[PDB]
Amino acid sequence: MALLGTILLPLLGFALLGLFGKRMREPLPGVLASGLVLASFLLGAGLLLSGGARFQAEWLPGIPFSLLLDNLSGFMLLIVTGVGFLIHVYAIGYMGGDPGYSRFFAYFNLFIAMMLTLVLADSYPVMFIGWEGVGLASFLLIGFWYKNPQYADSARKAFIVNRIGDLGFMLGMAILWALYGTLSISELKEAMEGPLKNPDLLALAGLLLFLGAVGKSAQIPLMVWLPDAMAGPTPVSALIHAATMVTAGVYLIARSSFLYSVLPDVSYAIAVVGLL
Amino acid sequence: ALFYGDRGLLSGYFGLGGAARSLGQGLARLQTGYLRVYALLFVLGALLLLGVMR
Amino acid sequence: MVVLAVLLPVVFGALLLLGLPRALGVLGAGLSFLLNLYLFLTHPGGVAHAFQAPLLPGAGVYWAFGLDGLSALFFLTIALTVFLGALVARVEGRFLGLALLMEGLLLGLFAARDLLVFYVFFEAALIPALLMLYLYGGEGRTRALYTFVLFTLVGSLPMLAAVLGARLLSGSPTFLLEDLLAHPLQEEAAFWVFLGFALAFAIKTPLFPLHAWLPPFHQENHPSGLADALGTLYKVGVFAFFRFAIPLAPEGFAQAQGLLLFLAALSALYGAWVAFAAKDFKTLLAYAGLSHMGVAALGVFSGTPEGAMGGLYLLAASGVYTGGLFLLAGRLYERTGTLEIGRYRGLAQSAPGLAALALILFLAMVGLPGLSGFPGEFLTLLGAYKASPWLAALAFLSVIASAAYALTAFQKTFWEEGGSGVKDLAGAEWGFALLSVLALLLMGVFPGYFARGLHPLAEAFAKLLGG
Amino acid sequence: MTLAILAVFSVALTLLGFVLPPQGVKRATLLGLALALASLLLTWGKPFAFGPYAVDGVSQVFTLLALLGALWTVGLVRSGRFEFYLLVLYAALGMHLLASTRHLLLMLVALEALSLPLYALATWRRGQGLEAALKYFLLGALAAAFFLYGAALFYGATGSLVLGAPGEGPLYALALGLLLVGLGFKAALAPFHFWTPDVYQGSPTPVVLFMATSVKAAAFAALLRVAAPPEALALLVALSVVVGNLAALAQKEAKRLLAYSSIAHAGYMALALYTGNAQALGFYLLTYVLATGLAFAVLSQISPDRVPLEALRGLYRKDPLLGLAFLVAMLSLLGLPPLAGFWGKYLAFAEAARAGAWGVLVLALVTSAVSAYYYLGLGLAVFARPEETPFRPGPPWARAAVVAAGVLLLALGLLPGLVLPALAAGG
């Protein structure tokens, strides 16, 4: 329950700054956002220092709600929380005289909570939840200044490519559900060891997972959507290109290393695409 | 193109309904009002019935 | 018991129709909502509120009702959606009584525990549709009315021969679903019965070749879209498929499974694709509803209880948020006067939370995780991939077009250059949007709580296709 | 002991019209019909037969319906010719005798006795009335000649002129066909349907009411005694319903369209003949009589000579209750829930499926779905913009009659298990 607070803080923050939002002074939304990010960095460092964390809640039959905090997840968590606190301060300074301050920092809080939902996941559907939440927050922030139509179609293209990647993700997950029936990365790893079965289907699922990763991290051919993210403010572009929404492409492969390692050809293809 | 095709499919449904009305007025044309016509068609239908009974 | 909640919207709609005032509909829909929620809680099982009364002893007709896991949450969904449409309506033509009557009719339709009462409600649901269509709006009202009504009736009337064959050829003494399920139909006889069922249920699903009645229906209703919301609730086809069509004649469904899955896939794709080409809100929302019905029918037809539970959950939730979008388009009409997508761009700056409401609704439409659409969408994907991967993959070249059309409409309606300026929100619309977002979040983030009654029916009727 | 009441009233009135004004004669006819109806009801569950006259549930129900139709059509007839009432009485008595015997020859005498006064009542002297009367009389005498040769070949296949005999092969089938010709003509079944549109269009509207209710009722009452083979029944149903609905699609006038619709409805009623249930058919005809008498009472309030479809429009604004009852009638004849037409239609289709005729039933259902086009184009026209049209908003007489008809239709549609328990011997 305590681990869920890391996500819940920049959700209550988002709700305050979105619903009421403009009932506050100008710095206060950024203040609340950066304070929640800091007290989430703190609670993540404290939970990791306690050895690790696990959380499981009731969900769809066969697909429960599983959060796992280990070294690999805590790495991304600390990175995102720290850089997010820094960029939140840089936005408090950088955002000035433009309306939507509260809305802007609510988008920030939502982005942070969704990225946390992504990294803290023992089940792939929770990873997909984080995927689509980050995509939505990106669509929103890229089109922050809505009064210009030009900086709307950029986020349109971004979310469309994102949903192509998400469809590949969904199909790979349906594959690794028809085969095994677990879809929880813990038991998925404990079940993928030993006598692999139908290696063609496994390589296909991994290839679709890599397709989703390409759209998320803007690899070839889906490269083109990333430059248009210039439409959004500079701190938005920073958070999108450095700490989040692209690093998830690498994190998916890091967690699915057990799958990609028994796929030599798929991994060689990943290397070729990375070089290109 | 799929929008135009959907419009065309609805047009084909329309054509089905129009075929129904045209068939209807061809059958309503059967009654002209000349009593000889009604008597002939009556006896014709009755003979068809009597043949069917076997 | 069940009959009380089934009849409450009927009697309230009567008291609004002949009696006064409009306000009676708001409080009536609220009482219905509370009663349907109370029935949704403490639900032990199917027999929860069982009702059995004789009507035609000799012919075999009985009022037969009961709350299955399906009947409970569909009662709750209908009550909620119609209450929202009752407060926000702004039609105020004094015909919200017709909306409550249709609500009660759909309730009796879902709660039917015997075949003939289900058939009776299926045929009765036609009258209010043509009524609120004809005298309460639309330029091509007569032609769209004839099209929709004739399609439904050409499907429905042969289904009477189908049900008469299903009862008589099985030697079932009654029309009770219990008894009828107790006596199976034979090969090349369940074939014809299922064919007569599949026509009437596909033309109302709707599937691809039989959807031509949907856009004209949605265009010429009252511009507020209350009639449109209730017609979207009138896509009960899938339900009748899962409970009645397949279990009563799986022998024909054996040959028809691939065909129906293909139809569902192409229908979903076609709807979500054409919705991009839509130049008005009614066309877009009609094609979107077609896509969602294709997805639901796919999930049910795939066997694979995953797919079936997904299809039903997606059906209920899609009814909810599509009715919400319809009412929203109607309110934006009443404050503006047009449903065109190109015009009236500046909305977002003038509409503070109406933008957020429309956004939440479109997100639930495209099936965003955390909102109501994604559980059904993904469970249906899993079940379909279990059944046939190819049609599931093709069918899910839909989320792409979903995002495309939804984002295009949202952007060019709200985001772009400021226009004249538009009213912010009405007082009733405040509760409308609040409750909309509440229900959407609760059904999307907590799909565990809802649909628990759907799992037993799903796995049982899916294993039924086996030995 | 109801037929005695009818005979006494008719024979006494025949002379009393010389001393009584036609209005007093009208009051007398109305009293006689109400007394006969009450005597029928007090005998409910008391079958009574003296000679070839035999009263069962069929006689009881169908004569009740015929008496209802006669009362309703007499209410509107206000001409100062007491003969214009006497004839009505005859038809009732005549139709009574038609449903009250199995004797084929007494069946012929009853048919002639109920039909002849209709020929004379159809004379408002409008030039179309003459043409209608001529077609009617000639085709009816042709059908009577066919029916008589059929009764003769029946006597040839069996020593008695009473139905139910064992029956031979080709000769019995042939006699059955020669009877079915006349009986379907009287019931307006195709391909004997030609006379019905012209006659309904030409005759004065209230007379068309009386016809389209009581004549069809008694015709099916007589059909129920016949053991019509399934092939003949299927052909009649197919042709009748198809032509009925299709030719009704092309109709521009309300009365002709309604005549073709009644051809289609006789086609539907011809399903209960599969089993001769006499419960399904009794229920169907109850609902049909009520709805059609209602519709034609409204049309008579509009115009006796001829009523186009546009005249129906704006009726709700003109008279709300009238438009509502007309909508009820159009839907009940469409056989749509929760109206009793659905229950009558279902009972006929259940009899048909129990007999095992499937494709015929499917074709009937498709034609009934096609019928919805004009059924709605009539029912929904009530709400349209009122165009130029004569409108006579009736006396309280016809208003109350129409209201009672619609109320009974909806009441028995919503809870059919009220009277349907007593359509057999009458518990």
From Swiss-Prot, chain B:
Q: Which domain of life is it from?
A: Bacteria
Subcellular location(s): the record lists: Cell inner membrane
Entry's transmembrane regions = 33-53
Q: What does this protein do?
A: NDH-1 shuttles electrons from NADH, via FMN and iron-sulfur (Fe-S) centers, to quinones in the respiratory chain. The immediate electron acceptor for the enzyme in this species is menaquinone. Couples the redox reaction to proton translocation (for every two electrons transferred, four hydrogen ions are translocated across the cytoplasmic membrane), and thus conserves the redox energy in a proton gradient required for the synthesis of ATP.
How this chain assembles, per its entry, is: NDH-1 is composed of 15 different subunits, Nqo1 to Nqo15. The complex has a L-shaped structure, with the hydrophobic arm (subunits Nqo7, Nqo8 and Nqo10 to Nqo14) embedded in the membrane and the hydrophilic peripheral arm (subunits Nqo1 to Nqo6, Nqo9 and Nqo15) protruding into the bacterial cytoplasm. The hydrophilic domain contains all the redox centers.
The text of the family note is: Belongs to the complex I subunit 5 family.
What's the protein called, per UniProt?
NADH-quinone oxidoreductase subunit 12
**Which organism encodes this protein?**
Thermus thermophilus (strain ATCC 27634 / DSM 579 / HB8)
The gene for this chain is nqo12
Question: What stretch of the complete protein does the chain hold?
Answer: 552 to 605 of 606
From Swiss-Prot, chain C:
Enzyme class per UniProt = translocase
What's the name of the protein? NADH-quinone oxidoreductase subunit 13
Per the record, the similarity remark reads: Belongs to the complex I subunit 4 family.
Q: Where in the cell is it found?
A: Cell inner membrane
Q: Which E.C. number(s) belong to this protein?
A: 7.1.1.-
**How does the record say this protein sits in the membrane?**
Multi-pass membrane protein
Please give the organism: Thermus thermophilus (strain ATCC 27634 / DSM 579 / HB8)
Assembly: NDH-1 is composed of 15 different subunits, Nqo1 to Nqo15. The complex has a L-shaped structure, with the hydrophobic arm (subunits Nqo7, Nqo8 and Nqo10 to Nqo14) embedded in the membrane and the hydrophilic peripheral arm (subunits Nqo1 to Nqo6, Nqo9 and Nqo15) protruding into the bacterial cytoplasm. The hydrophilic domain contains all the redox centers.
Q: Which gene encodes it?
A: nqo13
Q: Which GO terms describe its biological process?
A: ATP synthesis coupled electron transport; electron transport coupled proton transport
A GO CC annotation recorded here is:
plasma membrane
Indicate the transmembrane segments per the record: 1-21, 23-43, 47-67, 69-89, 91-111, 115-135, 144-164, 190-210, 258-278, 284-304, 308-328, 354-374, 390-410, 430-450
Gene Ontology molecular function terms on file: NADH dehydrogenase (ubiquinone) activity; ubiquinone binding
Q: What does this protein do?
A: NDH-1 shuttles electrons from NADH, via FMN and iron-sulfur (Fe-S) centers, to quinones in the respiratory chain. The immediate electron acceptor for the enzyme in this species is menaquinone. Couples the redox reaction to proton translocation (for every two electrons transferred, four hydrogen ions are translocated across the cytoplasmic membrane), and thus conserves the redox energy in a proton gradient required for the synthesis of ATP.
InterPro entries found in the cross-reference section:
NADH_Q_OxRdtase_chainM/4 (IPR010227), NADH_UbQ_OxRdtase (IPR003918), ND/Mrp_TM (IPR001750)
The UniProt keyword set, sorted, is:
Cell inner membrane, Cell membrane, Membrane, NAD, Quinone, Translocase, Transmembrane, Transmembrane helix
Q: Which reaction does it catalyse?
A: a quinone + NADH + 5 H(+)(in) = a quinol + NAD(+) + 4 H(+)(out)
From Swiss-Prot, chain D:
> Subunit structure, briefly?
NDH-1 is composed of 15 different subunits, Nqo1 to Nqo15. The complex has a L-shaped structure, with the hydrophobic arm (subunits Nqo7, Nqo8 and Nqo10 to Nqo14) embedded in the membrane and the hydrophilic peripheral arm (subunits Nqo1 to Nqo6, Nqo9 and Nqo15) protruding into the bacterial cytoplasm. The hydrophilic domain contains all the redox centers.
Q: Does the keyword Glycoprotein apply?
A: no
One GO MF term: NADH dehydrogenase (ubiquinone) activity
PANTHER family in the cross-refs: NADH DEHYDROGENASE
InterPro entries, A to Z: NADH-Q_OxRdtase_suN/2, ND/Mrp_TM
Catalysis: reaction(s): a quinone + NADH + 5 H(+)(in) = a quinol + NAD(+) + 4 H(+)(out)
Where, per UniProt, does this protein localize? Cell inner membrane
* Sequence similarity: Belongs to the complex I subunit 2 family.
UniProt name for this protein: NADH-quinone oxidoreductase subunit 14
- The organism is Thermus thermophilus (strain ATCC 27634 / DSM 579 / HB8)
Task: List, in alphabetical order, the GO biological process terms annotated in this UniProt record.
Answer: ATP synthesis coupled electron transport
> Where is it mostly found?
membrane
Membrane topology annotation = Multi-pass membrane protein
Of the GO CC terms on this record, one is: plasma membrane
EC assignment: the record states 7.1.1.-
UniProt cross-references to Pfam families, sorted A to Z: Proton_antipo_M
Please, which domain of life does this record's source organism belong to? Bacteria
> What does the UniProt keyword field contain?
Cell inner membrane, Cell membrane, Membrane, NAD, Quinone, Translocase, Transmembrane, Transmembrane helix, Transport
